[PDB]
Amino acid sequence: QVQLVQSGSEVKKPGASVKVSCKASGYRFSNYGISWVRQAPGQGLEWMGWISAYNGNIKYGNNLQGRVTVTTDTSTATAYMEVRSLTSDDTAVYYCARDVPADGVHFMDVWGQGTLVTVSSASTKGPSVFPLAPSSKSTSGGTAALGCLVKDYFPEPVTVSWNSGALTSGVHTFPAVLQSSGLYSLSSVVTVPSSSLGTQTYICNVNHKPSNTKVDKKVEPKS
Amino acid sequence: DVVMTQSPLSLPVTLGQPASISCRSSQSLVHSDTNTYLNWFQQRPGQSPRRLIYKVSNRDSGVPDRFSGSGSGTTFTLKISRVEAEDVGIYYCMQGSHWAPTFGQGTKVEIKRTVAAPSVFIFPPSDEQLKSGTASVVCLLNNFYPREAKVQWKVDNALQSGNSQESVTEQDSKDSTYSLSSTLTLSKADYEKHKVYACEVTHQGLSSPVTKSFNRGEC
């Protein structure tokens, strides 16, 4: 039950600032440090910094301009990381990890789930959800495929669930493709029993955190 | 700071066959306390890294025996005695001994599996999108291996060019198969110009190419 929970996705304008949070459970927070690591999308892990609730000691890897600031609140067992004067090169996923309390070896044994920070001068765009209805053309005997198409959204990410998380088996949410417009698009599909097309309800829960967009689209068969 | 050099960038392995990932370091990882300190992390897609090995060879809780660590000085290796489908993902080596903890580039581990033919489905454009002035036709190749598959769009039997995009899922963590969505995107005018829309799939698992088609009037 050692657990680190980070905040949701963030989109910021160039020059603005972001403050990711990292709430710890399952261990004495004051006896451990926190290391912050940056993973640019599709790139390797880069260590950013370390802060110890035990000592008060802070280390930064590369921060001559003072744009990054790692902090902690021991009372609420929460670490924070703040990045200021953001640039498009700061677009990345940020992780917090439990780490050594003093100057020993960093182990980083437990990580948080991550936080995607996107930096763009463009307005955030909500997705258009369209049904990929199941039909005879989308059936191969005892299985039928259905889905929805999430189209024309910026920036990433969109999280697609089915039936509020109750349908996860057989779900393929595809990675997003870059369109000519600069907007993203993906499709989420699922294979179900065709005999159950008459009695089951399949709903797309499309959530776009940057645009505050939450769309539920019911996918119903077509003859 | 220490430079972790990881090899190889990509490692395709067959189920039940071993895998070997090397991590070299610019400076010796033997610390003043006389213990060598190297960690190995596993990152499944969309998830955060999970620590598999600490202190060169020590397995963390819940880490299968199949994962093994070894090494000395600047040269270390992670081995998988028999690779299983649940081993898809990127593997990183990390040193925390020196002032700036540093990681390796990462090794993507892909699974080699028995040939499985795709299940082909086709979804015509919805009516809302047509109202919006665009038509997206979706062709879905489901649960196949190998990754290599040719999808060709034909509109009124004329082969299409330059107006479709493909997306491939991550290799499934259970059956080690892929899925692929080819999306042909047109304007509603181009969509109404023709009636027969088909996607033709060629794959190693199919003896002959499979075509799925629909007529614009019905479905």
Side-chain angles (χ1 to χ4, degrees):
Chain A
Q1 288 291 345
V2 177
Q3 196 176 6
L4 285 77
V5 187
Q6 302 182 215
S7 67
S9 310
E10 304 270 356
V11 55
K12 300 286 176 176
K13 282 197 290 184
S17 45
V18 63
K19 192 158 172 180
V20 186
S21 64
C22 174
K23 301 195 170 63
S25 324
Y27 65 103
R28 293 195 288 184
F29 181 79
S30 64
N31 287 125
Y32 288 85
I34 287 294
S35 271
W36 287 88
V37 178
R38 176 198 42 202
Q39 189 179 35
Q43 319 306 323
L45 298 164
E46 286 196 30
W47 176 78
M48 290 186 74
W50 171 80
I51 169 159
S52 166
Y54 181 70
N55 281 344
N57 293 0
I58 310 190
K59 296 167 56 162
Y60 292 104
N62 199 11
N63 197 15
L64 293 179
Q65 293 312 297
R67 290 176 46 252
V68 188
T69 300
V70 293
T71 58
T72 62
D73 193 2
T74 316
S75 52
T76 189
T78 301
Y80 306 89
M81 183 202 63
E82 181 181 353
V83 190
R84 307 171 52 80
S85 301
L86 287 161
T87 295
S88 75
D89 193 67
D90 297 304
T91 307
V93 186
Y94 296 93
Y95 301 101
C96 59
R98 184 177 89 168
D99 213 356
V100 64
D103 194 26
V105 296
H106 296 268
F107 37 85
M108 310 186 190
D109 58 332
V110 182
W111 291 51
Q113 79 272 9
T115 293
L116 179 57
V117 176
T118 317
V119 181
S120 179
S121 65
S123 305
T124 72
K125 176 69 188 73
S128 299
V129 185
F130 300 112
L132 301 174
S135 62
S136 57
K137 308 297 181 293
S138 80
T139 294
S140 68
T143 68
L146 59 102
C148 49
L149 167 71
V150 180
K151 200 183 182 293
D152 298 329
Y153 70 89
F154 181 92
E156 293 198 54
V158 291
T159 51
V160 182
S161 95
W162 284 89
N163 290 337
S164 307
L167 179 54
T168 60
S169 194
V171 177
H172 299 287
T173 305
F174 288 89
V177 303
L178 184 53
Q179 301 172 127
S180 55
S181 51
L183 302 175
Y184 298 103
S185 168
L186 62 79
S187 295
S188 193
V189 297
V190 52
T191 44
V192 303
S194 50
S195 59
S196 306
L197 289 180
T199 51
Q200 300 307 115
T201 299
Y202 299 106
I203 298 167
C204 285
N205 316 107
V206 177
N207 181 25
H208 189 217
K209 289 177 172 293
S211 56
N212 192 17
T213 300
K214 286 185 180 179
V215 173
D216 294 352
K217 191 56 55 176
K218 188 174 175 185
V219 182
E220 303 185 40
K222 278 205 302 182
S223 303
Chain B
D1 51 0
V2 179
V3 185
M4 311 303 282
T5 294
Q6 196 169 328
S7 182
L9 283 304
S10 193
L11 179 53
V13 182
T14 317
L15 289 158
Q17 292 298 298
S20 176
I21 301 170
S22 179
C23 186
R24 219 173 59 258
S25 72
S26 72
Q27 307 165 16
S28 173
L29 298 189
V30 182
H31 192 59
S32 49
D33 70 328
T34 70
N35 300 340
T36 317
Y37 284 105
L38 179 82
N39 308 270
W40 288 99
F41 293 84
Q42 168 194 72
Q43 195 179 29
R44 290 170 176 163
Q47 308 188 309
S48 69
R50 160 187 168 210
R51 196 179 69 171
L52 298 182
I53 307 289
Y54 56 98
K55 293 164 187 177
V56 171
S57 67
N58 295 8
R59 277 180 211 104
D60 218 359
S61 60
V63 175
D65 276 17
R66 310 174 291 102
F67 293 99
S68 175
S70 59
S72 56
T74 58
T75 303
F76 307 85
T77 311
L78 175 74
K79 289 204 188 179
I80 316 179
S81 59
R82 61 177 202 275
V83 169
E84 294 184 9
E86 48 169 29
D87 299 359
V88 291
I90 310 157
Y91 295 83
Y92 296 92
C93 51
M94 185 263 280
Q95 65 81 32
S97 179
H98 297 251
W99 198 94
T102 51
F103 295 84
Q105 291 82 73
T107 292
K108 181 175 182 187
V109 163
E110 308 162 332
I111 309 296
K112 291 186 187 170
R113 180 219 130 90
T114 55
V115 172
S119 317
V120 187
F121 314 96
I122 187 165
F123 304 89
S126 55
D127 279 323
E128 315 173 4
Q129 195 180 16
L130 287 175
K131 173 185 176 299
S132 181
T134 304
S136 283
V137 193
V138 178
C139 189
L140 168 66
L141 290 62
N142 204 37
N143 303 348
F144 64 92
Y145 184 85
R147 179 195 292 266
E148 304 87 60
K150 194 182 71 173
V151 185
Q152 279 185 332
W153 282 96
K154 294 196 282 191
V155 176
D156 288 0
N157 211 11
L159 179 61
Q160 285 305 296
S161 164
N163 42 9
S164 57
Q165 305 190 43
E166 278 184 14
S167 189
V168 186
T169 58
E170 176 63 55
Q171 195 169 20
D172 197 76
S173 66
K174 296 301 176 298
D175 56 26
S176 309
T177 70
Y178 300 87
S179 298
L180 188 159
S181 76
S182 192
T183 311
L184 173 78
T185 317
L186 304 170
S187 69
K188 101 170 301 180
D190 299 338
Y191 180 67
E192 290 164 353
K193 283 176 62 173
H194 313 276
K195 278 188 97 291
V196 172
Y197 287 81
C199 59
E200 177 176 37
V201 170
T202 314
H203 191 261
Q204 183 181 346
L206 299 177
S207 308
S208 301
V210 162
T211 297
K212 289 272 183 166
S213 67
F214 65 94
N215 278 12
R216 177 172 55 88
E218 52 270 2
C219 184

